[PDB]
Amino acid sequence: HNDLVQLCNPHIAAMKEDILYHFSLSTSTHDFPAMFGDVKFVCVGGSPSRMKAFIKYVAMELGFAHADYPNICEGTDRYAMFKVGPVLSVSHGMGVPSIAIMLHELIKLLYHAHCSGVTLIRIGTSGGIGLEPGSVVITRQAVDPCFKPEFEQIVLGKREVRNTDLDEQLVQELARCSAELGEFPTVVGNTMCTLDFYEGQGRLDGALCSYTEKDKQDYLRAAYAAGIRNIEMEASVFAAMCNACGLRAAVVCVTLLNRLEGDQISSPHDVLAEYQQRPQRLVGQFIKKRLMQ
Amino acid sequence: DLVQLCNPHIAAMKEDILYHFSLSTSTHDFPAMFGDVKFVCVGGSPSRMKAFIKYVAMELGFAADYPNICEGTDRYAMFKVGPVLSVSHGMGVPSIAIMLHELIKLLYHAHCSGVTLIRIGTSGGIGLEPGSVVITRQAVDPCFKPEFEQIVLGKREVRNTDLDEQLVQELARCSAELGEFPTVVGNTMCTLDFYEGQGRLDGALCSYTEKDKQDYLRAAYAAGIRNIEMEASVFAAMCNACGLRAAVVCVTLLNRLEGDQISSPHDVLAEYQQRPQRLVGQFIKKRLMQ
Numbered sequence A: 001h002n003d004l005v006q007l008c009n010p011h012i013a014a015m016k017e018d019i020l021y022h023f024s025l026s027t028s029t030h031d032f033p034a035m036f037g038d039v040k041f042v043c044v045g046g047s048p049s050r051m052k053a054f055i056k057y058v059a060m061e062l063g064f065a066h067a068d069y070p071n072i073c074e075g076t077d078r079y080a081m082f083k084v085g086p087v088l089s090v091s092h093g094m095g096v097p098s099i100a101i102m103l104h105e106l107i108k109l110l111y112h113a114h115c116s117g118v119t120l121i122r123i124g125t126s127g128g129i130g131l132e133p134g135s136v137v138i139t140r141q142a143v144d145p146c147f148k149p150e151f152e153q154i155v156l157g158k159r160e161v162r163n164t165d166l167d168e169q170l171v172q173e174l175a176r177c178s179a180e181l182g183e184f185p186t187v188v189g190n191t192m193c194t195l196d197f198y199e200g201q202g203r204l205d206g207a208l209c210s211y212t213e214k215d216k217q218d219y220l221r222a223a224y225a226a227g228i229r230n231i232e233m234e235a236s237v238f239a240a241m242c243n244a245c246g247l248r249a250a251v252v253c254v255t256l257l258n259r260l261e262g263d264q265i266s267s268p269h270d271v272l273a274e275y276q277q278r279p280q281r282l283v284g285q286f287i288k289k290r291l292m293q
Numbered sequence B: 001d002l003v004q005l006c007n008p009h010i011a012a013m014k015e016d017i018l019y020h021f022s023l024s025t026s027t028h029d030f031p032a033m034f035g036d037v038k039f040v041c042v043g044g045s046p047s048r049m050k051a052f053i054k055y056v057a058m059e060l061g062f063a064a065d066y067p068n069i070c071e072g073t074d075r076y077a078m079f080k081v082g083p084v085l086s087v088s089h090g091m092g093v094p095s096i097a098i099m100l101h102e103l104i105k106l107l108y109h110a111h112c113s114g115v116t117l118i119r120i121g122t123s124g125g126i127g128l129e130p131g132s133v134v135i136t137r138q139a140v141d142p143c144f145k146p147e148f149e150q151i152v153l154g155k156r157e158v159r160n161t162d163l164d165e166q167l168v169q170e171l172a173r174c175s176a177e178l179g180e181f182p183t184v185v186g187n188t189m190c191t192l193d194f195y196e197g198q199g200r201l202d203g204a205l206c207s208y209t210e211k212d213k214q215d216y217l218r219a220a221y222a223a224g225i226r227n228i229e230m231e232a233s234v235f236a237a238m239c240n241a242c243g244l245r246a247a248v249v250c251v252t253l254l255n256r257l258e259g260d261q262i263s264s265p266h267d268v269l270a271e272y273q274q275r276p277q278r279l280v281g282q283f284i285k286k287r288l289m290q
Ligand SMILES: O=c1ccn([C@H]2C[C@H](O)[C@@H](CO)O2)c(=O)[nH]1
Pocket: A046, A093, A094, A095, A124, A125, A126, A127, A128, A197, A201, A231, A232, A233, A234, A256
């Protein structure tokens, strides 16, 4: 049995209208069950254009192809959203707080639509550590910049922490799907999630930087030693919030560069757009496989 | 005065790729493109910011196409008319922080001078009639402290988050020459979360009560806080660090002492979000006449 989507906030049951402000959707103007009740896979990534390309790429592989793919979030540009069959594709921008909003309103949408048996997957990009550019990483543990699998949030002035473990079973399943493809290297490892892309990640090419290359290396290698294989900016909340709500979730990012050799993203554009299809492809394999049982 | 960075590594690089802008030192002529820029405005929405550069252009008589300079990506949107640069930054400290790092570099590559950065944004109000525009005196964290904390190489760092004291009053004066809407100067709280992080009850997650919220928001009001948003802290911190004169002008979209949801008619909300645009336009008008 596929369990219903639950919230962890008793206030929503008691609201006469629930306005999903950043989606430009509302219970009083939209029928959630009719629009989303059949959704089973939610896919989320930073760029809206990427997540559109995804809903197109994926429609083709389940034979939905032809067609136009309307943005469900018309009347807003905070987030883009697309649906095809049981697959929802939603952008989330960059950074913990941007994705945190998307998730808050997303989960509520699933709860309103009365969805059940949903899987959430982040298809992102990252920087790798001691991996060839182009490798995809399936996250076991989202980790903070001190390598603790914790996510910290300040509520009413007090610090609260939730665990950022990702469903073990799903990472092993994803592992298998990538192999069925045999198209690109894929490892599982821990993902370090930061709040800054430059100083936040040992980079030497920001506007500010009070440290040396030798300092960047020491830090980055220490991270690798702790089981860390890539670096991005959303894995923590994603893990934390899904766990908080009992949702099955996973994170699949391609690395765009090996950080032990550089900071700047200087691959030909043609190569970087290939890199970014890898996670879409992998997740493509996962959904197709799942819809055959 | 010339824009600068506190980063020596940049001068040594054979090229500077601004990934999130889709802009490069070697595919792009920075001085040619941005050298004349005197006023940089930033905001969350790519729509609001296109709208802004359009409104400005007319108020300065440049009025009919406005090209997204950041075509080749959709991370951020960028526009230009005259000495006015308009930029999107999405939502949240890390999103604007990336925009900032790359923006500040861009300005240094164009070797601009006498620049002013302004975040024209939206917010939640505390004890302010909705539609009220706040001018940030002091960006502040969820503990009411004027510090911005950042982890670098595993170690904690904090920076002061005060905005230019002369610039805020100058903006207050400009809002007064307008006399179109209420403008207060107060402290702005900057949070990493819009829902649980801002004491809302309508999140997907929430284990407190309307009372706990009330007592928290009021504590903030007592601490001199008039609005809540999600960018002030970094924007402040980074500018101080690079010695740029910067301000934060935000329209309140609801009284957080009264509710959590953003319920007002699209008509009204649109009008609100034009207000900070109008003030900033004034300020630009003024600066050029002098
Ligand atoms: O070195 C990198 C490369 C990519 N990203 C992720 C997160 C961010 O939002 C986006 C930037 O391309 O992808 C990183 O965090 N670090």
